[PDB]
Every structure is written in C-alpha cells, then in structure tokens.
Amino acid sequence: MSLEVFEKLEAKVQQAIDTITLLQMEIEELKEKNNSLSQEVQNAQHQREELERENNHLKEQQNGWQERLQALLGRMEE
Amino acid sequence: MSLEVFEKLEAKVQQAIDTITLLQMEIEELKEKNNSLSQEVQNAQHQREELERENNHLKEQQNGWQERLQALLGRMEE
C-alpha cells in the first residue's frame, strides 16, 4: 500500500466519521426539539382541561342569574 | 306598587341581564381561547409525529455510514 492509496483512504474514514457525528448532532437536536414540543402539548392540555372547568363554573353561575332574572320578573308582574 | 318599589326592581332586572350577558361573553372567549389551544395541540402533534420520522430516517442513514466506516477501516487494515 503506497502513501498514495493510504491517504486517499484515511481521508474517507474521516468523512465517514464526521458524519456519524454531524448526524448524531442532528439527532440530538430533534430529540430535543421534540421534547420541547412534548412540554408544550402538556401545558396546552393542562390549560385546555382548565378552561372546560372555568367554563362550566360560569355557565352554571349564568344559569344562576338566568333565574334570578326570572324570579325578578315574576315579582314585578305581581 | 309605587313608582318607588318598581324602579328599584327594573334596575335589578337590568343587572341580572347585564351579567347573563357579560358572562356569556366570558364564555364565548373561553370557547374560543380553547379552540385556539386545540389548534395548537394539533400542530404540535402533527409536528412531533413528523420528527420521530425524520429522526428514524437519520439514525438509519447514520447506521448506514457507521459501516461504510467499518468497511473503510477493514480495507485499510489489509
């Protein structure tokens, strides 16, 4: 093996290795960009499930007044 | 019923109504603020499920090179 065959090889080994790297970086970034979105889908869910609750508190309170308004009108019509 | 009993009533009716209102508004805003968050939890999911796919494309392609490197080294050691 001439210093010529050899060096054309040592340089391909590099590049194969550079890329196993780089690619492992790109993997690491998605593993993380996805963990960030997981976290987001969690605060969106913990927030949505907490609207449905305030919503029900109000609808109930408004059906409260919706009668206090109907009481009030009956008292006025007599 | 004096113009006095009457007007103290007509004014409470108002306020019962004003609030059936206002509250119906607050309902409408949550019905919507929640629909906005539903839409977000959908693009987060359609995006996360699309990372898991690019991720697997790379890990595969990196296991590609991970041998192209090992092929390359065997050729250099003979």
From Swiss-Prot, chains A, B:
GO terms for biological process: division septum assembly; FtsZ-dependent cytokinesis. GO terms for molecular function: identical protein binding. It is found in: Cytoplasm. It comes from the Bacteria. Residues 46-60 have a biased composition (Basic and acidic residues). Residues 34-65 are annotated as: Disordered. Non-essential, abundant cell division factor that is required for proper Z-ring formation. It is recruited early to the divisome by direct interaction with FtsZ, stimulating Z-ring assembly and thereby promoting cell division earlier in the cell cycle. Its recruitment to the Z-ring requires functional FtsA or ZipA. NCBIfam families: PRK15422.1. This is Cell division protein ZapB. It comes from Escherichia coli (strain K12). The gene is zapB.
